[PDB]
């Protein structure tokens, strides 16, 4: 039973702000032009392996489940394009799924591996930083023990936390500069 | 060719081999790759798009602004940071909105994208820049072996901005593979997902490993020898990820993984101690015997 | 004498007046000169808004008219009518968009759309004061009709105009008539036998004492205007004498060259030396120089000596007053969604394929069977909407017979095998006229045939038995289906035909978004064109099916028979003409103008040049070439522009 | 600021065009007024010139694509004049942008659409032709 | 009107005009065929021409009388959602 | 993932011989004429209350779900016939 009082008629409006500029309004307003016709949930690999359906993320958008945000189910897809190669609709899936998780991300729905990936580039530029197993590695092959990248870079890595503290980024994620660790 | 090698972090700093076997292979091919001295993570389009768009899209410009100040494009052998860097590129010439936004935060750091950045993915830059001819008359050792040729999806997709052709039934990297002597076995579901992607590898993976197994599956009733791709992602998933499958799912396979520039070392020659092999969790060896 | 405008706005309900602010734009109006009476009206082209211009050029002594609403394409003739009935010439009445160029493109900028609106009327308002009396020229109707295209629709405006006893010429591109329903095993939604119902029209064609059928021809100019057309039809060289050819198709063994024989959509295989169809109209047969290698083998089995590759087309010129353009439709080609793998997998076909392997007299002997191993198809799956309703294709419309062909179809199959499981993946099913949901009830309830709401996201084939997977998501159920099919049927939508492009240069007619030909308006005129005489009948106008294909057929007839019947037509005299005191004789205007109008001759001791009137289409491409200013296209004079680019910034 | 644009169109294929586009409600900005001619071929230099005098920031001009001129030819001679219009203009000191030439056919609604923000923008981006000013002087 | 979004007035008001003024056209409004009698290209009609009360030729149809018209009947044209009066003209463009 | 080898095809013929002649084959093959609009669904009381949806035991017998026979949900109906009584389809 869904009344009117547990919908959100300003959900598409929401997500298609949150897409603006980046990725960018027509991009993301494309999701109006969805007739729920299922091509994008039949080329999904991981709705083939879980109760994830693509079609119903989009469907719940313009119905105005804000539950939506809530789901595990818009994290199982892997931006693999496929719904977006194939959408005769032009609706650019992909990218509104991306946007439909910012909105997910402001609300606290962000898990911690992924929090902790963010922390990584944040805390030395690299998602997969550099080890000591990694200098003796290079080492051995013939390729400079540490690799001309941000993470050994001051002047990169400072760069990088102003853009962070400018875009708030620090504070979606829960960073704490002090502690230099996730709150 | 000059080129500003971006390199990621997968490959510099866990699958070194792979950076090793792209730099002889390309000057190998006259390619000149130049230091992009102090570039980051792209950052991940997917795990990072998914966060927050004006982080991913930002701190991509960051790095296009590296290569612009050289005066030079941009060249990689992950479709990771392929994708990311390319899309980061074509949004800032496409959108003003976006381009005002980003360069109003590089301001901050003193940098500023003026849109002359062309971002390249070695596999594309081989097949219509160098040629696939150039390959065969580099092959010192042929590979006669069979592969199962993984594309990745960020290599082609979102063919929109790509225009690298057909990403439903591409020729493309089996040209590059087949030149080296050996056979790119057609196999089910060619084009799927390896199951990494969008953060789903971190944050779900016993689904990912799914995905990466029904494709290990169908290359090996093929009769594929090992796997070839070009995303340091899909390697280490489908490399890595072996490992997670037969602690979690209970499936062996030791099927021998490979990155095709590593690919490319071995048929012009290389020494395998050089493609470091022997940091890969699936032994290689397997494949050297047959080859 | 001074110019005296009466300026009228229209709101059109609240299409203008919603976005324009219609008092505000007639207010502006009065201040301009010469602009005597200025009026706002809800719906100007209505009886009271006609009465309202009529009354005040009467009342107000008016010279000039100006219309501030619709586009003139639509409406021109109306108010040219209505000022007319006036006492005002037409000529001297001037349309000013602010509905398809203003208020429906700024919807959202209803400021900036009122000063737009203003400018618009001040640019007319600044034409209208130069425009000059015109006299309309009554020019007469060639008492004959001409229709392009020999399917069911051609048929119909051939049979019909020759019935009211008007003179028809009625050309066919390939060997015979028939069209795309000649290749129809049944037609739904009374599965009657297609070429049994089509064929007794052929005939009454092929004998019409008014009708004179050219087939295996082709037009290759048109020049003129409404009513005094003439027309070129190549009547194409068949390579075999007609009147000694008998159809009985043995000098087709010899033939070395195999052809795919397109009647088959490319299944079967005909030969250079070949016939379209068994009940083909006119039965007789044709050479394909295309593939023809000229080894004479053929003639060597003939008898009578019909072949003569000596043969040359014809070249007939006819008068016509009147042209219909039914030249029909072509299938989609859905190898472009490479995910259903149609030309990679043997398995995979075109309902336009299927409706030939059905047909009893197709290359399979009316046999459905699967094109891999020769084997009849257990388990069929149709996909609905191939080719339509589709972005990524660029065809964003709806084909509109596919969903009832795929269900017809599945009867028949059923018919002929019941135990044959089909499926249908659809989206929405469109079963809109009479007898068609019922149709659609029918197929489900009476022959068992199944529906699957969920648009298919690709087709898989096994390689080890041909067979292929259809993965889709019942959205009805929310789960993920991948059911195995022996064959798989793709309802492939309409484009138009492949010729459509020369018809279009020839005739001089315009294409909506659809790539389909362009009607003068779809309510007010859905079988005329903007092109005066010039009519379209059946699909190559848009999508659709064989009655609404017949009615289309009769429209274009009626339509196409008012000129005939009239014996006279009104054309404007928008025209070029060379003031001979001011042309030296520099002969930059005559290369200019595609249909020779003018011309270089001797006039009081000197050469000067001299538009021929007649001749003169009103493009305007000569005066704007002529360096001396002496030639000038009325209505459109140097002056006349002159004024009009003013008015945008200033009146004048 | 607002551009001012001036608009030439043929009444056959282009007017088409830019009427599917109303019809389509496909929203452009209202800085463009369009003038009617039966063909492109109508047009010529001074039209284009006598805008520019009178203060356009921009000229657009749009007629049916080559080869299907309703008049068959017209726009072909259109085609040799805009392309020698383009460089008088720079050597008049007016940026050959502030010109924009098109070929667009009934079905090209989007098209027209798409080519009057293109345009716009272009000129916003330009700003003002400062010819009339410099000429009141 | 779909799918063009035109009022409706566009398309058919002008063929109600050339309609009511056709040289070849005689229009009997308020009127209903009774009776038909005979067979094709021989048929015998009756027409009734309804009374409507009011002179047709000296009618101006300006609408005075509907101001002072005490009476309101349910207007059909409206659907029964608007209130007509007892001497009437159907709707404006009529 | 549904696929051929889980479906039973038969299950709409196998209900309608299980119909005939009690309550009568023209009865029982109604279920072909279903076009799945949910009027039955909107109008089961039962359905308020639980994850029973009446248009999904009709689709699972057309497209041959043999599981609807083990389902708890075809055992919630309570024969109120408001869906028979609204059917546009004259489904029974
Ligand atoms: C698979 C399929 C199944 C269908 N099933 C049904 C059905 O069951 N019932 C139904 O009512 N409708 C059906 N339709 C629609 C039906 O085919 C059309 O309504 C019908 O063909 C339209 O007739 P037409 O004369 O307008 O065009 P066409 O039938 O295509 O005829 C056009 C004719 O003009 C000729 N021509 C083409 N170009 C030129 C040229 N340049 N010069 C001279 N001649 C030219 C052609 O050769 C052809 O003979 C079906 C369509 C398809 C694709
Ligand atoms: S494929 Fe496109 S139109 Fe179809 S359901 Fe998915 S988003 Fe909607
Ligand atoms: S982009 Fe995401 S939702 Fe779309 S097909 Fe890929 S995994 Fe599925
Ligand atoms: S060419 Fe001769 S053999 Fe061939 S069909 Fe005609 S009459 Fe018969
Ligand atoms: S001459 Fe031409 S038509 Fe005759 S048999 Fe040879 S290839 Fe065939
Ligand atoms: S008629 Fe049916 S199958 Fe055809 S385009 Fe329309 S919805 Fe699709
Ligand atoms: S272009 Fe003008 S001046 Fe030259 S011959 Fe023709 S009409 Fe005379
Ligand atoms: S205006 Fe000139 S070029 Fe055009 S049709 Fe007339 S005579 Fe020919
Ligand atoms: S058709 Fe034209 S004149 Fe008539 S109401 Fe609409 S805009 Fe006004
Ligand atoms: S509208 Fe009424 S008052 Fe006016 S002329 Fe007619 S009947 Fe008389
Ligand atoms: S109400 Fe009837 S047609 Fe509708 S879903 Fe239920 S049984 Fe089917
Ligand atoms: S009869 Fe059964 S299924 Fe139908 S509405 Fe009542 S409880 Fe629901
Ligand atoms: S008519 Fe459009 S350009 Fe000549
Ligand atoms: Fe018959």
Redesign the interface.
Known sequence: ?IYSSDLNKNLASQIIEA??????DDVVSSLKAC????????????????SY?T??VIRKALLGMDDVLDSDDI????????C???????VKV?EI???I??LA?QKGN??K??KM??MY?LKY???????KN?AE??KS???SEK?????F?E??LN??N???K??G?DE??GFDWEKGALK | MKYAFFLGCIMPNRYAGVEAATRTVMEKLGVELVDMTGASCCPAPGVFGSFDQKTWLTLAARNLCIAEEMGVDIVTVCNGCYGSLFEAAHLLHDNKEALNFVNEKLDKVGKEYKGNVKVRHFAELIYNDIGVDKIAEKVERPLNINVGVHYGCHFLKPTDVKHLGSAERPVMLDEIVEATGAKSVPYADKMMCCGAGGGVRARELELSLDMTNEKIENMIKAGADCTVNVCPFCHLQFDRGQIEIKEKFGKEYNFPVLHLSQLLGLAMGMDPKDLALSVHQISVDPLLKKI | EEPRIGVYVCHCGVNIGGTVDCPDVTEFAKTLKNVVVARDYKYMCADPGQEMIKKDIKEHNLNRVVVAACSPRLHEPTFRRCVAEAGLNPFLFEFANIREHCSWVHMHEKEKATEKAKDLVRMAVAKARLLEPLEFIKVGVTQRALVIGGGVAGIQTALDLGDMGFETILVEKTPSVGGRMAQLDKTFPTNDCSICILAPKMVDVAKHPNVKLYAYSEVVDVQGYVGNFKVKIMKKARYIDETKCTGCGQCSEVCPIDVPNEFDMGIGMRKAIYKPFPQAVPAKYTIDKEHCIECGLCAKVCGPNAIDFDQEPEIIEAEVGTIICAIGYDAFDPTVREEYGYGVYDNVVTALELERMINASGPTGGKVIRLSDGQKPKRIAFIQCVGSRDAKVGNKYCSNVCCMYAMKNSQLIKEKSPDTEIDIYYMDIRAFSKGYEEFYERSAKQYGIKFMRGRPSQVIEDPETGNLVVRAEDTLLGEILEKEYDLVVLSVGMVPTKSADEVQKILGISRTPDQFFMEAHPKLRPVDTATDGVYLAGACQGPKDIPASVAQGSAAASRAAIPLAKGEVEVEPIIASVDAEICGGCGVCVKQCPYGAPRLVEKDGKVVAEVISALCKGCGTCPAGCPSGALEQDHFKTIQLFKQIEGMFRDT | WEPKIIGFCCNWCTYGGADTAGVGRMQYPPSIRIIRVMCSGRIEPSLILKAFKEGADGVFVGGCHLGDCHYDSGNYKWQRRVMMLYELLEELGIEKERLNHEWISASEGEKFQNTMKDFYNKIEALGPCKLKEELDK
């Open positions: 039973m897409g603006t500029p980046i990725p960018g007739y729920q016709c299922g091509t994008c949930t039949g080329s999904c690999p991981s709705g083939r392996r879980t359906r079609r119903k994290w199982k897809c892997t931006t693999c394009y496929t977006y190669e194939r959408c005769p609709r032009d992909t799924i991306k946007t998780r910012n991300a962000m898990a591996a992924h990936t963010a580039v530029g690299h998602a997969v930083p550099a080890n990694t590695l290079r092959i013939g390729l690799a001309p990248i941000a993470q870079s002047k990169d760069e990088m102003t853009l962070i400018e875009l980024f979606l994620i």
